[PDB]
Amino acid sequence: PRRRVIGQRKILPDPKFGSELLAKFVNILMVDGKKSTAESIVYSALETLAQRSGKSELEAFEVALENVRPTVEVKSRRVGGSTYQVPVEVRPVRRNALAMRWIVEAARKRGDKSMALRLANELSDAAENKGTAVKKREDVHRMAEANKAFAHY
Amino acid sequence: RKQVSDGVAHIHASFNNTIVTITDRQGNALGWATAGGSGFRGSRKSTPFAAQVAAERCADAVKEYGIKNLEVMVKGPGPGRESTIRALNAAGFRITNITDVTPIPHXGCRPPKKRRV
Amino acid sequence: PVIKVRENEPFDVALRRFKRSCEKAGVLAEVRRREFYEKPTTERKRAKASAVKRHAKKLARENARRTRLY
Amino acid sequence: KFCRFTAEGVQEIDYKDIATLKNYITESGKIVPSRITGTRAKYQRQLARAIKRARYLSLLPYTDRH
RNA sequence: CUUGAGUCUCGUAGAGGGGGGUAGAAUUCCAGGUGUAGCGGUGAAAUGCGUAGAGAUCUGGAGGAAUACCGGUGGCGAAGGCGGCCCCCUGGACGAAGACUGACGCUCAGGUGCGAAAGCGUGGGGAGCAAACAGGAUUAGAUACCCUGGUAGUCCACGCCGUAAACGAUGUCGACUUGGAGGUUGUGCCGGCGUGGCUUCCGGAGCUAACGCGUUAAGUCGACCGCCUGGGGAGUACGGCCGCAAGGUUAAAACUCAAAUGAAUUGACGGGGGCCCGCACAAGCGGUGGAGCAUGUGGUUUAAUUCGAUGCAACGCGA
Numbered sequence A: 001p002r003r004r005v006i007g008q009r010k011i012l013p014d015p016k017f018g019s020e021l022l023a024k025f026v027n028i029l030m031v032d033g034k035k036s037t038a039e040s041i042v043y044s045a046l047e048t049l050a051q052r053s054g055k056s057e058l059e060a061f062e063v064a065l066e067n068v069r070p071t072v073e074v075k076s077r078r079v080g081g082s083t084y085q086v087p088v089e090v091r092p093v094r095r096n097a098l099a100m101r102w103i104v105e106a107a108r109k110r111g112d113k114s115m116a117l118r119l120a121n122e123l124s125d126a127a128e129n130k131g132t133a134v135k136k137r138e139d140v141h142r143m144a145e146a147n148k149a150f151a152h153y
Numbered sequence B: 001r002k003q004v005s006d007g008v009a010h011i012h013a014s015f016n017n018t019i020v021t022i023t024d025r026q027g028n029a030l031g032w033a034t035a036g037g038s039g040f041r042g043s044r045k046s047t048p049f050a051a052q053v054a055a056e057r058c059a060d061a062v063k064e065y066g067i068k069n070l071e072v073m074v075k076g077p078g079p080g081r082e083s084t085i086r087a088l089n090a091a092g093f094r095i096t097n098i099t100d101v102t103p104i105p106h107x108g109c110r111p112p113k114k115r116r117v
Numbered sequence C: 001p002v003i004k005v006r007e008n009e010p011f012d013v014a015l016r017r018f019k020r021s022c023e024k025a026g027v028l029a030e031v032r033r034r035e036f037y038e039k040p041t042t043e044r045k046r047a048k049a050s051a052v053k054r055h056a057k058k059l060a061r062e063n064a065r066r067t068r069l070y
Numbered sequence D: 001k002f003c004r005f006t007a008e009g010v011q012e013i014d015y016k017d018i019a020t021l022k023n024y025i026t027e028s029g030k031i032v033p034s035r036i037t038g039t040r041a042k043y044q045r046q047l048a049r050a051i052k053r054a055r056y057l058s059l060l061p062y063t064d065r066h
Numbered sequence E: 001c002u003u004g005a006g007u008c009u010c011g012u013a014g015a016g017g018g019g020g021g022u023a024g025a026a027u028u029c030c031a032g033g034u035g036u037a038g039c040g041g042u043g044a045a046a047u048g049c050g051u052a053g054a055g056a057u058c059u060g061g062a063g064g065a066a067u068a069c070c071g072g073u074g075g076c077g078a079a080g081g082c083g084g085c086c087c088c089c090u091g092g093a094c095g096a097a098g099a100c101u102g103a104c105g106c107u108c109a110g111g112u113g114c115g116a117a118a119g120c121g122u123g124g125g126g127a128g129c130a131a132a133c134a135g136g137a138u139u140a141g142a143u144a145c146c147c148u149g150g151u152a153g154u155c156c157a158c159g160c161c162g163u164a165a166a167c168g169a170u171g172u173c174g175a176c177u178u179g180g181a182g183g184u185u186g187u188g189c190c191g192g193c194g195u196g197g198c199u200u201c202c203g204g205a206g207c208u209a210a211c212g213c214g215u216u217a218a219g220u221c222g223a224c225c226g227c228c229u230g231g232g233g234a235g236u237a238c239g240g241c242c243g244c245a246a247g248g249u250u251a252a253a254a255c256u257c258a259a260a261u262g263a264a265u266u267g268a269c270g271g272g273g274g275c276c277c278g279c280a281c282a283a284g285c286g287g288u289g290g291a292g293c294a295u296g297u298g299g300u301u302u303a304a305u306u307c308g309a310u311g312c313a314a315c316g317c318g319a
């Protein structure tokens, strides 16, 4: 906004693991204020993911996140009728936010039956650079690299 | 083939492009690269970054000559004047002299008419 | 703007020296000036307007130093 | 400032005095504006004439890129 | 007679003019060397150029035009104009001491001369630039603006043309009338104090419709000249004179309107400027636009489909 009085809202950590990051993930998954439903989906997917990976719930989640977090993105800027995709650094909170949003979006277009299974499959795939979330991260990075010249805008 | 170890980097920095030619001290070209030939067209061609990539590529094109020392002649007002020299330095060349050789008439011929945009 | 890199001089320092030599010799201003033909009437108009604005600004500054803003 | 030629009582500038004239040209060989050296206008004109004469005789360069 | 006007003596600054020569930078072209896949251009492109080797870079050559810096609300000239350096010929201005002539002055219809750029004639020259022209774009179109090329012309000699917002939109000459800050160019005396010429800015009285002008007047006066008399028709037609032509110059009428105009004021507006704000963008989340159905409207239909609301601010609105 023009004035800038805008500051983090307090986020309660998820009950099972005490992770604020996981609570944000639940919020991103939630539809229509149905937080308990989203929590159940996330916990089921995390349990499946830990069984498949042997790591842990939180560690497997972090490993999936690291492969989807972007480092650079483009912001449009119109100059002479043409718009200049100017590559900018992505600050850490936005990296996490974009990664979780992309993971949820990718899991929602999967073909598996339950959303918990789709989410576990997406997290597993991202743990080894395979899912469409990792593909979106790669596309964002390549679009930013193609515009590396226009870094002063 | 022939080893030179002492060369000149000519940076033709125009508003639309940057040509980097590396010559021996007698003016014979050894290799060249341009911002326009380094995967940059249109708007991206005339940027300091495209000029930097052209400088890197021209430095690569003369690796076989074993050049170690570079005089730098800069010509033109383009955005690639400085970044080209920085990239030639980061390529490992010992830059021993930088000269501006931009042609200035001492009056000379009448320039083209002013654009009306 | 001929520049010779002195011994034990870091590259960035000598590049700055060359840049300052060029900015002092006015090469880029001369190049930009000579891109297109400007009619003598336009040149005289520009010079006259620049002198007039310089004088008016100087007088405004001198007479504002006698002015309290608050 | 300190226009030297009035304080030296010169009648001319002497194009053959390359020492003096080198103090009125930049490192690229350009004549220095009198608003920088503080030369008086009359002697600035004499100085420009002398420098041009010296350049013709190749006692001074026109530029630093001959 | 000497105070206006002029002559002489000594110096001073100056892109004043005419003629000739010459220098360095750069562009283009030509020849060759190195080298290799692009160059160039734009908002983005494309035309264009390039493997028949361009562009870049080096060497040598040819040719034309203009003189960076100095350079300056600096200088010179009646105005138009005038800019590297050197010589030849030449005009004016100014200052200091005097000496000399003795009103020889001012203005000027007609006349005569000069007079930017473009244009015209003859003969040269032609690098760069560029009306015309061609192509590529843009666009609804684009006979344009942008791009790639490009001929007259721009340059020289001689002749013509005689016009420009040829402007300070301010005729010439003389006198007088508070100040301040500069620039430039002389000169006197001891960096200070004077005293002349030209010139930039501000401003006082006064003047002015106002804007402004203000010792360089648009103030206060005198001499003489030019010119105006509502807007349009029209600086046109016809006639004359001039011109090779293009056209110039002198210059109406019928008819028509009740205005046209200047300066300033308050708004509004601007693809003017500055500073701010709003779920206005941006960042997001969920929708509408597709389906069925509800509901209102338009329309069509009807005997009647009652009346009203009907850009935002009517359309689940009066109901």
Ligand SMILES: [Mg+2]
Binding pocket: B112
């Ligand atoms: Mg151009």
Ligand SMILES: [Mg+2]
Binding pocket: none
């Ligand atoms: Mg007459």
Ligand SMILES: [Mg+2]
Binding pocket: none
């Ligand atoms: Mg002409």
Ligand SMILES: [Mg+2]
Binding pocket: none
């Ligand atoms: Mg002719």
Ligand SMILES: [Mg+2]
Binding pocket: E126
């Ligand atoms: Mg030609």
Ligand SMILES: [Mg+2]
Binding pocket: none
């Ligand atoms: Mg053109």
Ligand SMILES: [Mg+2]
Binding pocket: none
């Ligand atoms: Mg007239």
Ligand SMILES: [Mg+2]
Binding pocket: E166
């Ligand atoms: Mg004029």
Ligand SMILES: [Mg+2]
Binding pocket: none
């Ligand atoms: Mg004028």
Ligand SMILES: [Mg+2]
Binding pocket: E169
């Ligand atoms: Mg007039």
Ligand SMILES: [Mg+2]
Binding pocket: E203, E214
């Ligand atoms: Mg005034």
Ligand SMILES: [Mg+2]
Binding pocket: none
């Ligand atoms: Mg007529």
Ligand SMILES: [Mg+2]
Binding pocket: none
């Ligand atoms: Mg938005």
Ligand SMILES: [Mg+2]
Binding pocket: none
């Ligand atoms: Mg619908």
Ligand SMILES: [Mg+2]
Binding pocket: none
């Ligand atoms: Mg109704």
Ligand SMILES: [Mg+2]
Binding pocket: none
């Ligand atoms: Mg109605």
